[PDB]
Symmetry: D2
Subunit: 309 residues, 4 copies
């Protein structure tokens, strides 16, 4: 298997806290937070670790929050390659409400990057050897022009780095601007925005995915469909995989778990069907766990065996 790297331009040090009730105006007393790594590529690398593989997470880190982020990943045995940034690593908030069992997730932008910090990040990316896989996942932080992301991807592909993309909005469109992306995983909202049209008819998702493949923007499009599983599209195949009928406890982290799983199958040169099935297995495995916990090896294996008959 070739080596796997992930890139998170907007990582975070997330706080998970608990409060008895939720209501406006008054002070909600919240417990001492538990800190956890945040960010698309970072969680993809964590999911891969859970599944028994290894992925090196590349990301900017700033201030004491950044140091703690790196410290957390060290304890989880997730290898990293960081760039020191001036602006401190930002924090998102996850609140569990004890009385209802509900969770609330407040997602703010990542820290700013200056041009020099982005250049260092690109330098880290270009140290990746030909044939290896790079997963670019997450939002685009302030300070980065859209074309800089496209230029990074182009440079990467130029020296044989195989790119996988999970993003949204203008970043996702920009990441796909040059094309030849190995794999992209939009969810339904992300797909609709990317093809710039509403997907209201039964066959619209399939057709939109095929449109992306046919255009040369991506070799593989896996449209993830929440509880309905996913639809994977190749130049030769269209397959839908639906998860088993088991209740979701918490959907947080399903997307990153699926991407990490599919990345591993891509590294193994698996078939489209095997890739999508393993992706659904890990994404749905993620839903079995409370709060922000990602997929576990054993749950993913169990669901994958079910999906494989």
């Amino acid at each position: 298997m070739v080596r796997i790297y992930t890139l998170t331009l907007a990582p975070s040090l997330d706080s998970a806290t608990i409060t008895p009730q939720i209501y406006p105006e008054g002070k909600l007393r919240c417990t001492a937070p538990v800190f956890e790594p945040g960010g698309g590529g970072i969680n993809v690398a964590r999911a891969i670790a859970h599944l028994g593989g290894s992925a090196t997470a590349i990301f900017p880190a700033g201030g004491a929050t950044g140091e703690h982020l790196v410290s957390l990943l060290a304890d989880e045995n997730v290898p990293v390659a960081t760039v020191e940034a001036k602006d401190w690593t930002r924090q998102n908030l996850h609140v569990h409400v004890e009385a209802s069992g509900e969770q609330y997730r407040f997602v703010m932008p990542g820290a700013a990057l200056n041009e020099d910090e982005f250049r260092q990040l690109e330098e880290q990316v270009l140290e990746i050897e030909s044939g290896a896989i790079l997963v670019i996942s997450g939002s685009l932080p302030p300070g980065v022009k859209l074309e800089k992301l496209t230029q990074l991807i182009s440079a990467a592909q130029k020296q044989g780095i195989r790119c996988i993309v999970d993003s949204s909005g203008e970043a996702l469109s920009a990441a796909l601007a040059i094309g030849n992306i190995e794999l992209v995983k939009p969810n339904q909202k992300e797909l609709s925005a990317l093809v710039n049209r509403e997907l209201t008819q039964p066959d619209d998702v399939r057709k939109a995915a095929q449109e992306i493949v046919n255009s040369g923007k991506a070799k593989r499009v896996v449209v993830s469909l929440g509880p309905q599983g996913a639809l994977g599209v190749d130049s030769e195949n269209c397959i839908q995989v639906v998860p088993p009928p088991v209740k979701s406890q918490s959907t947080v982290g399903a997307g990153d778990s699926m991407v990490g799983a599919m990345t591993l199958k891509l590294a193994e040169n698996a078939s489209l069907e095997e890739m999508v099935r393993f992706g659904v297995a890990a994404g749905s495995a993620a839903t079995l766990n409370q709060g922000t916990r990602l997929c576990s090896h054993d749950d993913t294996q169990k669901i994958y065996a079910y999906l494989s008959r």
Copy 2:
């Protein structure tokens, strides 16, 4: 095609109202309500009308609220057969919040039924011809012992009335106590309560469904799975049908729409596959319409065509 009847032991006259915001403590000023028919069997009959068929709704009605319920169904051209009850027809409340677009649904028990009234309802059911279909759908109202529900179904079956059951809790178990039910449609929670175990493993739903068929309790079990569609089980077949990837606007009425569709297919003596496909098409068609609106013929046809492609 044989004739179709439905039975709703706990009907309601539902109020749909609108308010700008939702918050506790203060008076929420709600608009003058729009009244609509409520109740499982009643909604099955309405869905059947939408799909081009005809079903007679049997139910107790009491007071001016009951009169209005009857009048609403007359205006919708749904045939009825009623028993006048002493306790007035109860009301559930549907609240649309303008600021969020969210809907809140407060579901209270149906009016009480005395023993005389239940025997009157039983008399109506036993006037149904042999070979016709009776759909018993909805909650069990106060005043009716579970044994009486068992007795009604046993009485109906002895003379060739084909029974379809959609209920929950002790009522569902009681309805299946006699066995030889033509079709039962539990959702996942209802199936779990019926077999009395958590269904936490991938194959648990299928195994539970097969257990009910094998035990002779039901000829067909269709476990409905929300956005995952449904799993249909026979003595000979097992199929899962997943809806197309279209966004749900409002899930209200999905269950009764699905039951209405499957009932029509059952009356046409369709295959298990055709029955479940049409059921999923109608159930998911219902979700395309806002609020409490059930499935439309055209949306159901479109989804069914896709599933049958």
Copy 3:
């Protein structure tokens, strides 16, 4: 003491129910409701009963819901004078959420009145002897022109009936159109709407209340101020009364409790200070009790003793 009557043109049979959690989209299973009398004048009469006096509630009642409303008042020993109405007595909903202890209150319009039913109600009102007190409290139901309310009040005053008004919006303005109202109790929002201006400066409430008295619209204006108590205004006096610093459990019914209390003091020809103090005592006593329960005699007496030094 002279006799006391209340008029409720829009009464209701309210349902109080309990549900474990509150959230949109899904069915919220609510307990078998406890029915209670609803409507301004009706609750004023109930509050008066709690305080040891007697008030006859005049109101339209229709259908089985109306009969149960009358039945509830009989059990509480509240004398009534009803007019049978064609349109059935409507229901508001009070929902207690067990997990949070919050209550939600959905308030819909009252049943319609036709011209004949209103004429009968006016006839009941004009049977009231000179010197007696009539409390007109609550919203204006559909079917009643604004000037009909004004004409009723004018006719009442013409034969010596002393009128007290608690209402809002166009109804309140109309009720005050002719003037010489003995007592009106707007809250702050109601006062602002009545004088048609925002009350943003420290002395604005006082000035607005005095404007109403000086105009001849009302002899006494008691602006109720929620937790801040009330400001009472006469042609000769301006007094603010603030409740004791005890936590409110539930504010439902505070307004009607205050009005019933003030009505009793008006019947005793009490001073403005005594009237307002007893009103604050009963209104704040109401807040000590969970849900919709009105003021208790003992709590009101205790707070009144405190307010009187």
Copy 4:
């Protein structure tokens, strides 16, 4: 006028963000946060600046978040005296929901303080001149034994530093353990916890306040009562001051604004009446401004003039 200092053992760098709707499970996309100074003593110092006075804020600051906190105060021209702490300055989150206009406030503990750092803070406090005022306001951060808070206050008082305390829980009791506190401002809940009993009777708050004065624990006790204003108690006087009837826009910052105002009055050696009046004026002035904004000079002056009329 003597000099004024404040002490905030648990400061914060607060993030204020905006999101369109609030609901659980999904990612709530929040705007790039606006940062603001947080913490009891810090806010007291800011309120004092608004009211035209000057107060030096003493607090631990750590990391880039602490640097930003210090920078924000510099921009607001609030003098500070800081101790560099190992643990980085923590962040609370204020969320405005656009659809409802509601604000949600998630309050987490302050950064940890080690024993060395606390002694450094103690050293700063003991550099305050005799006769000057020190306001100790806010929660107690992890790492500080209650006895150390008692020791700090005892140390300060021995050399003529006049101490004002605003806190809660065990910290408030510990702060009052030494006695001879110049002024304490519990709210109702804080007073109840302090005297360890429910305050359910009309005179309970006053009696509890007098108990603290009589015991020698505090020279002055001002129990703040939210919209009911405040009750101020001396060895010689007892007064209640109620704000004018103006609608609160947002209650955030009322407490610290009130403390800032009373501190300034205390420095001017004002009467108990003048102190409580100005306190209520500033507290209520704070409520006129949206979000976390404290009292403005002009609004405070306007309310104070009314209270003094």
